[PDB]
């Protein structure tokens, strides 16, 4: 699924996820968020299962973006955990955790959770 | 916090997280899980906020492990999202999402969620 | 939104959520899961914001199902946290946590996370 | 575990959870949050597995609080999903989702996630 995953993906928010899958399981690229006071591209890295089950299962993957680039610093990071589903309409189906740097007093509200679905169009 | 983060961390399960923080926000290293039929070291990559708030806030970070190495393939990936808290007892406080590759029929039960706290001892 | 919420809802899995919203913020009813070896109806209870913002915001709500009825006992419970969005196509948009009773040794894999979207058709 | 669960519990934040477990699986009571601009008691309802496994497993449960009482309205709701662990030091180990009522434009940041551990002291 190296070629399956490599490319440009869009989620339901209009965000842009540009990734290369390495033969070794690497994910590298850039993320551009349509929401959350992000601007321009942010580095992302992650991993995927480079030898997935042959049984019709999705391919497990995740990646991280720290929301610091030359334009802005949100003092936060998102991880997306999900699976690549190949075929007519290839999807990456994810759930994500965004942790903001906080004081101990605000640690309880440090983390947002959501779900993003990525498509090739 | 590059030096703060770089090193060997342990969670409440006896898992071992070995990471280097790059000046550019990179996280690279290896993870060894004490649970979940993992064996030996797995590659991890992630990101951290290399220019955190100066106001006593934690430093946002996350990373990914795909559970494939030369020993095993769980057909899964975990992301940890959290923050590094410096000082006497440095912590990485995380929440995690583990996605298993599944069929569409099992996609609803694809994802586990938990929380790991990492200490330097 | 008492009348808005009261009724029969379906999620993307074909599950059936039958709820009454009380004037006091109560949610009571039954859930029938199309997946996960559930059979027939299970009691649910929850709460909703009976005096929501007037500013176009959704109405916050959640509810719990313990997966025990006269037919089966999964030794588990799901909570759905989300918001009711009124209008042409009323939705309840949720995220959920399913905790299984486990031993301490399996506590780390106790909890599944997902997202369900409920519609009136 | 009806008697096990019934009582007054405290989490790591100094919050107060007062619950009665019904013979029928009901949870009813009040929650007082030490954080998050909550004041005084809020109604909670939930469910627990009234016939748990006999094998040393925890007892699955969850409950909901909508953050409206006579003092305040946060336009939000939290669900706690977890398990009751009996014995010398009885615990309720939970993970929680807090959904705020939002506009569609802010729906992506509607939901906070955390973990609370409740003890009888």
What whole-number distance in Å separates Cα of residue B30 and Cα of residue C12? 38
User: What's D13's DSSP letter?
Assistant: T
Residues 27-46 of B with CB under 8 A from C: 35-36
Q: Which residues of C touch B35 (CB under 8 A)?
A: 105, 108-109
Q: Which string of DSSP letters, residue by residue, matches D23-65?
A: TTSEEEEEEE-SSTT--S-EEEEEEE-SS--SSS--EEEEEEE
Tell which A residues from 41 to 80 touch B, by Cβ distance under 8 Å: 43-53, 55-68, 73, 75-80
Task: Check CB contact of A14 with chain D, cutoff 8 Å.
Answer: no
CB atoms B68 and A50 under 8 Å: yes
DSSP, collapsed to helix, strand or coil, labels residue D15 as coil
Considering only alpha carbons, which residue of chain C is nearest residue D76? C60
Residue in this structure with the two tokens 């000046």, named with its chain if needed: B23
Rounded distance, CA C68 to CA C85, Å? 30
C101 near D CB under 8 A: yes
Query: Which chain C residues contact residue A114 at CB under 8 A?
Result: 95, 115
The number of beta carbons lying within 10 Å of the beta carbon of residue C105 is 10
Are D32 and D42 within 8 A, CB to CB?
yes
SS3 D4: helix
Contact criterion met (CB below 8 Å) for D78 and D64: yes
User: In the Cβ-directed half-sphere of D33, how many Cα atoms lie within 13 Å?
Assistant: 21
Expressed in angstroms, the distance from the first to the final Cα of chain A is 18
Residues with Cβ within 8 Å of C74's Cβ and at least 6 positions away in sequence, in order, are C36, C37, C38, C67, C68, C100
DSSP, residue by residue, C4-62: HHSEEEE-TT--EEEEEE-TTSEEEEEEE-SSTT--S-EEEEEEE-SS--SSS--EEEE
Where exactly are the structural domains of chain C? 2-119
Secondary structure of residue C106 in the 3-state scheme:
helix
Residue D85, chain C, CB below 8 Å: the answer is: yes
Yes or no, beta carbons of B58 and A102 under 8 Å apart: yes
| Cα–Cα distance measured from residue B55 to residue A105, given in angstroms and rounded to the nearest whole number | 13
What is the resolution of the experimental data for this entry, in Å?
2.0
Annotated binding-site residue? B31: yes
Task: Tell me which residue of C8, C5, C9, C55 sits closest to C25, measured CA to CA.
Answer: C5
The reply to whether D115 touches chain B by the CB within 8 Å rule is yes
C26, two tokens: 């109560």
Is the separation of the CB atoms in D19 and D28 below 8 Å?
yes
Question: Half-sphere exposure (CA, 13 Å, Cβ side) for D49?
Answer: 28
How many angstroms separate the Cα of B105 from the Cα of each of A54, A61, B56, B109? 16, 19, 46, 9
Q: What angle do CA C110, C101, C41 make, to 5 degrees?
A: 105
Q: What is d(CA D117, CA D94) in angstroms, rounded to the nearest whole number?
A: 6
Cα–Cα nearest to A100, from B81, B46, B60, D35: B60
* Residue D88, SS3 per DSSP: coil
Number of H helices, E strands in chain D: 1, 8
Nearest CA in chain B to D117: B115
Q: What class has domain B2-119?
A: mainly beta
Q: Do A103 and B57 touch (CB under 8 A)?
A: yes
Give the chain D residue nearest B82 (alpha carbons): D114
Of the candidates C18, C19, C35, which has an alpha carbon nearest to the alpha carbon of residue C27?
C19
Burial of A37 (0-12, 13-18, 19+ CB in 10 A): exposed
């Amino acid at each position: 699924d190296q070629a399956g995953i490599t490319g440009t993906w869009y989620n339901q928010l209009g965000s842009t996820f540009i990734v290369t899958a390495g033969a070794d399981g690497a994910l590298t690229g850039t993320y551009e968020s349509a929401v959350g006071n992000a601007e321009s591209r942010y580095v992302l890295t992650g991993r995927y299962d480079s030898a997935p089950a042959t049984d019709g299962s999705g391919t497990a993957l995740g990646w991280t973006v720290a929301w610091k680039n030359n334009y802005r610093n949100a003092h936060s990071a998102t991880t997306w955990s999900g699976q690549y589903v190949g075929g007519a309409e290839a999807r990456i189906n994810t759930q994500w955790l965004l942790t903001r740097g906080t004081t101990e007093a605000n640690a309880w509200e440090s983390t947002l959770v959501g779900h993003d679905t990525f498509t090739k169009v």
